[PDB]
Amino acid sequence: MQDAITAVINASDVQGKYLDTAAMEKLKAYFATGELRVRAASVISANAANIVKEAVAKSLLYSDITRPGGNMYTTRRYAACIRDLDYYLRYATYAMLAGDPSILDERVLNGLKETYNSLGVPIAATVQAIQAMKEVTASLVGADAGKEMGIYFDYICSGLS
Amino acid sequence: DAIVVPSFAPVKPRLDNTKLPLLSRAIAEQEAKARQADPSKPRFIELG
Ligand SMILES: CCC1=C(C)/C(=C/C2=NC(=C\c3[nH]c(/C=C4\NC(=O)[C@H](C)[C@H]4CC)c(C)c3CCC(=O)O)/C(CCC(=O)O)=C2C)NC1=O
């Protein structure tokens, strides 16, 4: 398992060395910014439904995707699409709290591109929907917290593409 | 003994039309306007 503090600990364990000053400083930075990250994460969870609604409205709705034959034409596909965005956001916020991009790669980005390719989901459309979520999440979270959230959101998009 | 005018040979034109400027504009317009929204119709969001 990987977290920001845990990854510093894991690197130190591989060395076998006692805690270095550089390791202490990096861990201190994680301790320092945890407050802003925590408050924003709570806000994200509270307004999670509104965020995915805003994202599909801004990117994935009123287009050919939701018009016939667009991989969202049916209610089953639409429900799976909003569910997929919801999972993307949930594991992304998990990782944003953790501070480490490794967690999302472990769960969200493990075979995700292959699965989407097999099912015929548009990779680009998913990426643009993720970016639209990034804008909405930045608006709700605020600039300081949203910038941190944006980095891990963008890591998810990079894994997809 | 040769025939100066043996027969008049048909020629295949080199320049293919529907690439010519006027038809090309019109072909673009008909295609693009068809893909766009249609005036005077009740249902337009249903169409793919
Ligand atoms: C094949 C199954 C299927 C259906 C049916 C379907 C419909 C559908 N209805 C939509 C919107 C909508 N649907 C309604 C529905 C209603 N508002 C009302 O007052 C009524 C009570 C009610 C209908 C009689 C509204 C208001 C919107 C627009 C939402 C908005 O933009 O504010 C949207 C999102 C906007 C878009 O088209 O991109 C879809 C996809 N999609 C599907 O995949």
Short mmCIF file of C-alpha atoms and ligand atoms in Angstrom, two decimals:
data_model
loop_
_atom_site.label_atom_id
_atom_site.label_comp_id
_atom_site.label_asym_id
_atom_site.label_seq_id
_atom_site.Cartn_x
_atom_site.Cartn_y
_atom_site.Cartn_z
CA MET A 1 0.00 0.00 0.00
CA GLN A 2 1.17 3.54 -0.80
CA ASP A 3 0.43 6.92 0.79
CA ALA A 4 2.54 10.08 0.83
CA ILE A 5 3.83 9.57 4.37
CA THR A 6 3.88 5.80 3.88
CA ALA A 7 5.92 6.15 0.67
CA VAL A 8 8.52 8.26 2.47
CA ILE A 9 8.61 5.54 5.14
CA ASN A 10 8.88 2.81 2.49
CA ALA A 11 11.83 4.48 0.74
CA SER A 12 13.55 4.87 4.11
CA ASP A 13 12.87 1.19 4.85
CA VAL A 14 14.50 0.15 1.57
CA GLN A 15 17.58 2.13 2.60
CA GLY A 16 17.30 0.77 6.14
CA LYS A 17 18.42 4.19 7.36
CA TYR A 18 16.96 6.11 10.26
CA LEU A 19 14.75 9.06 9.38
CA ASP A 20 16.67 11.68 7.41
CA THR A 21 16.14 15.42 7.68
CA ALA A 22 14.88 15.48 4.09
CA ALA A 23 12.38 12.72 4.90
CA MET A 24 11.27 14.64 7.99
CA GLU A 25 10.76 17.80 5.93
CA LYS A 26 8.66 16.03 3.29
CA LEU A 27 6.54 14.34 5.96
CA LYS A 28 6.17 17.72 7.69
CA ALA A 29 4.84 19.24 4.45
CA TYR A 30 2.23 16.47 4.25
CA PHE A 31 1.27 17.15 7.87
CA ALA A 32 1.10 20.87 7.09
CA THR A 33 -1.24 20.80 4.08
CA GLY A 34 -3.49 18.05 5.45
CA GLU A 35 -5.89 20.63 6.90
CA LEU A 36 -6.79 22.27 3.59
CA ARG A 37 -6.98 18.88 1.86
CA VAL A 38 -9.34 17.49 4.52
CA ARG A 39 -11.77 20.41 4.42
CA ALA A 40 -11.94 20.32 0.62
CA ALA A 41 -12.48 16.55 0.61
CA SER A 42 -15.49 16.93 2.90
CA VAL A 43 -16.91 19.62 0.60
CA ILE A 44 -16.39 17.35 -2.43
CA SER A 45 -18.25 14.48 -0.78
CA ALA A 46 -21.14 16.76 0.18
CA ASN A 47 -21.56 18.16 -3.36
CA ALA A 48 -20.55 14.99 -5.23
CA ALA A 49 -23.89 14.51 -7.02
CA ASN A 50 -23.97 18.13 -8.18
CA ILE A 51 -20.42 17.83 -9.52
CA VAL A 52 -21.11 14.86 -11.80
CA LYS A 53 -24.35 16.51 -12.94
CA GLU A 54 -22.43 19.67 -13.81
CA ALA A 55 -19.70 17.68 -15.56
CA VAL A 56 -22.02 15.75 -17.87
CA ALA A 57 -23.96 18.95 -18.60
CA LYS A 58 -20.76 20.80 -19.49
CA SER A 59 -19.12 17.99 -21.48
CA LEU A 60 -21.04 14.76 -22.10
CA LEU A 61 -24.68 15.86 -22.51
CA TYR A 62 -26.61 17.45 -25.38
CA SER A 63 -24.38 15.86 -28.01
CA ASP A 64 -24.13 12.75 -30.17
CA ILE A 65 -22.84 10.71 -27.21
CA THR A 66 -26.28 10.83 -25.60
CA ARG A 67 -28.07 10.96 -28.96
CA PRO A 68 -28.75 7.61 -30.67
CA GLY A 69 -25.82 5.26 -31.16
CA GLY A 70 -23.45 7.32 -29.04
CA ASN A 71 -22.62 4.76 -26.34
CA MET A 72 -24.95 6.60 -23.95
CA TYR A 73 -28.10 6.39 -26.05
CA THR A 74 -29.65 3.83 -23.69
CA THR A 75 -30.48 4.28 -20.02
CA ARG A 76 -28.17 1.40 -19.05
CA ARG A 77 -25.21 3.10 -20.71
CA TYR A 78 -26.13 6.49 -19.22
CA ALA A 79 -26.40 5.02 -15.73
CA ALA A 80 -23.03 3.32 -16.15
CA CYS A 81 -21.52 6.58 -17.44
CA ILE A 82 -22.58 8.68 -14.45
CA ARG A 83 -21.57 5.78 -12.19
CA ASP A 84 -18.14 5.69 -13.83
CA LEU A 85 -17.68 9.42 -13.27
CA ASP A 86 -18.79 8.94 -9.66
CA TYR A 87 -16.20 6.20 -9.10
CA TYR A 88 -13.55 8.33 -10.80
CA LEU A 89 -14.31 11.15 -8.39
CA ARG A 90 -14.50 8.91 -5.31
CA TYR A 91 -11.15 7.19 -5.80
CA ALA A 92 -9.64 10.50 -6.91
CA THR A 93 -10.76 12.15 -3.66
CA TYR A 94 -9.44 9.16 -1.72
CA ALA A 95 -6.09 9.74 -3.40
CA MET A 96 -6.25 13.51 -2.91
CA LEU A 97 -6.71 13.01 0.83
CA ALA A 98 -3.85 10.51 0.80
CA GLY A 99 -1.68 12.99 -1.10
CA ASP A 100 -0.09 10.28 -3.26
CA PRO A 101 -1.01 9.61 -6.91
CA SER A 102 -0.01 5.94 -6.47
CA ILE A 103 -3.37 4.88 -5.01
CA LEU A 104 -5.38 5.79 -8.10
CA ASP A 105 -2.95 3.91 -10.34
CA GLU A 106 -3.34 0.89 -8.06
CA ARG A 107 -7.14 0.83 -8.31
CA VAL A 108 -8.56 3.36 -10.78
CA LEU A 109 -5.91 3.04 -13.50
CA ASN A 110 -5.20 -0.72 -13.33
CA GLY A 111 -6.45 -2.07 -16.65
CA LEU A 112 -8.94 0.79 -17.04
CA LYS A 113 -7.72 1.76 -20.52
CA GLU A 114 -7.86 -1.85 -21.72
CA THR A 115 -11.37 -2.32 -20.32
CA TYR A 116 -12.66 0.88 -21.94
CA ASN A 117 -11.04 -0.03 -25.26
CA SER A 118 -12.69 -3.46 -25.20
CA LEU A 119 -16.16 -2.11 -24.39
CA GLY A 120 -15.97 0.69 -26.96
CA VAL A 121 -16.10 3.64 -24.57
CA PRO A 122 -14.60 6.78 -26.16
CA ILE A 123 -11.30 7.36 -24.37
CA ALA A 124 -11.23 11.01 -25.44
CA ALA A 125 -14.80 11.63 -24.26
CA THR A 126 -13.95 10.15 -20.86
CA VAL A 127 -10.86 12.37 -20.68
CA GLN A 128 -12.87 15.51 -21.49
CA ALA A 129 -15.51 14.52 -18.94
CA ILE A 130 -12.74 14.14 -16.36
CA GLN A 131 -11.46 17.61 -17.29
CA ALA A 132 -14.98 19.03 -16.95
CA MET A 133 -15.17 17.45 -13.49
CA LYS A 134 -11.82 19.09 -12.78
CA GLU A 135 -13.27 22.52 -13.55
CA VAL A 136 -16.41 21.92 -11.46
CA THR A 137 -14.41 20.45 -8.57
CA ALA A 138 -11.99 23.38 -8.68
CA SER A 139 -14.93 25.78 -8.49
CA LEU A 140 -16.44 24.08 -5.44
CA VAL A 141 -13.18 23.29 -3.63
CA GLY A 142 -11.49 26.63 -4.22
CA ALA A 143 -8.21 27.48 -5.91
CA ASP A 144 -5.75 26.34 -3.23
CA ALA A 145 -7.43 22.99 -2.65
CA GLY A 146 -8.64 22.62 -6.24
CA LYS A 147 -5.09 22.96 -7.56
CA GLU A 148 -4.08 19.99 -5.41
CA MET A 149 -7.18 18.08 -6.53
CA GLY A 150 -6.48 19.02 -10.14
CA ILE A 151 -3.07 17.35 -10.13
CA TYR A 152 -4.50 13.98 -9.12
CA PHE A 153 -7.50 14.37 -11.44
CA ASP A 154 -5.04 15.08 -14.26
CA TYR A 155 -3.08 11.96 -13.32
CA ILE A 156 -6.29 9.97 -13.83
CA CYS A 157 -6.73 11.57 -17.25
CA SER A 158 -3.11 10.81 -18.14
CA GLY A 159 -3.64 7.16 -17.27
CA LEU A 160 -6.72 7.05 -19.49
CA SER A 161 -4.86 8.56 -22.46
CA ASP B 1 -2.61 5.41 -98.42
CA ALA B 2 -3.00 6.93 -94.94
CA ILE B 3 -6.17 8.60 -93.67
CA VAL B 4 -5.41 12.10 -92.39
CA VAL B 5 -8.66 12.17 -90.41
CA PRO B 6 -8.95 8.53 -89.28
CA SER B 7 -11.68 9.29 -86.73
CA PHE B 8 -12.14 11.78 -83.93
CA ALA B 9 -10.90 10.29 -80.67
CA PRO B 10 -12.97 10.87 -77.52
CA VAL B 11 -11.05 12.28 -74.57
CA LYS B 12 -11.40 11.55 -70.86
CA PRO B 13 -11.26 14.93 -69.07
CA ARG B 14 -8.40 15.33 -66.63
CA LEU B 15 -10.18 17.75 -64.28
CA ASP B 16 -12.86 15.95 -62.28
CA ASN B 17 -15.90 18.08 -61.51
CA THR B 18 -17.43 18.17 -58.02
CA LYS B 19 -13.95 19.42 -57.23
CA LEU B 20 -14.57 22.57 -59.28
CA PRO B 21 -15.12 25.69 -57.15
CA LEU B 22 -18.87 26.16 -57.54
CA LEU B 23 -20.01 22.56 -57.00
CA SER B 24 -17.50 22.20 -54.16
CA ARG B 25 -19.09 25.10 -52.28
CA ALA B 26 -22.54 23.65 -52.92
CA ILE B 27 -21.56 20.12 -51.89
CA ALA B 28 -20.12 21.51 -48.66
CA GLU B 29 -23.30 23.48 -48.00
CA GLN B 30 -25.73 20.62 -48.62
CA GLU B 31 -23.69 18.23 -46.47
CA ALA B 32 -23.13 20.66 -43.59
CA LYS B 33 -26.69 22.00 -43.55
CA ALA B 34 -28.05 18.44 -43.56
CA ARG B 35 -25.95 17.56 -40.51
CA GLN B 36 -27.06 20.80 -38.82
CA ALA B 37 -30.46 21.41 -37.24
CA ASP B 38 -33.49 21.39 -39.53
CA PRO B 39 -35.90 24.35 -39.71
CA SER B 40 -39.66 23.78 -39.39
CA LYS B 41 -39.80 20.41 -37.65
CA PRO B 42 -41.10 19.37 -34.19
CA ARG B 43 -38.47 16.77 -33.25
CA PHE B 44 -34.82 17.70 -33.75
CA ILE B 45 -33.00 16.42 -30.65
CA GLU B 46 -34.08 12.84 -31.42
CA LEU B 47 -32.24 12.61 -34.75
CA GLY B 48 -28.70 11.26 -34.60
C1 LIG C 1 -33.15 5.43 -24.18
C2 LIG C 1 -33.35 6.01 -22.76
C3 LIG C 1 -33.00 7.47 -22.64
C4 LIG C 1 -33.82 8.59 -22.41
C5 LIG C 1 -35.26 8.59 -22.25
C6 LIG C 1 -32.99 9.75 -22.37
C7 LIG C 1 -33.41 11.06 -22.17
C8 LIG C 1 -32.69 12.28 -21.74
N1 LIG C 1 -33.38 13.32 -21.20
C9 LIG C 1 -32.55 14.34 -20.87
C10 LIG C 1 -32.85 15.53 -20.32
C11 LIG C 1 -34.06 15.99 -19.71
N2 LIG C 1 -35.18 15.26 -19.43
C12 LIG C 1 -36.11 16.10 -18.84
C13 LIG C 1 -37.38 15.44 -18.48
C14 LIG C 1 -38.58 15.90 -18.02
N3 LIG C 1 -38.74 17.17 -17.54
C15 LIG C 1 -39.99 17.30 -17.21
O1 LIG C 1 -40.55 18.38 -16.69
C16 LIG C 1 -40.87 16.07 -17.44
C17 LIG C 1 -41.65 15.66 -16.19
C18 LIG C 1 -39.90 15.13 -18.01
C19 LIG C 1 -40.23 14.34 -19.31
C20 LIG C 1 -41.64 14.22 -19.67
C21 LIG C 1 -35.56 17.41 -18.75
C22 LIG C 1 -36.16 18.69 -18.19
C23 LIG C 1 -34.22 17.36 -19.31
C24 LIG C 1 -33.24 18.48 -19.44
C25 LIG C 1 -32.47 18.73 -18.26
C26 LIG C 1 -31.79 20.08 -18.27
O2 LIG C 1 -30.98 20.35 -19.11
O3 LIG C 1 -32.03 21.02 -17.38
C27 LIG C 1 -31.18 14.01 -21.20
C28 LIG C 1 -29.96 14.87 -20.99
C29 LIG C 1 -29.75 15.97 -21.93
C30 LIG C 1 -29.35 15.36 -23.23
O4 LIG C 1 -30.19 14.87 -24.01
O5 LIG C 1 -28.13 15.40 -23.45
C31 LIG C 1 -31.29 12.69 -21.75
C32 LIG C 1 -30.07 11.97 -22.23
N4 LIG C 1 -31.71 9.41 -22.55
C33 LIG C 1 -31.72 8.10 -22.70
O6 LIG C 1 -30.60 7.35 -22.91
#
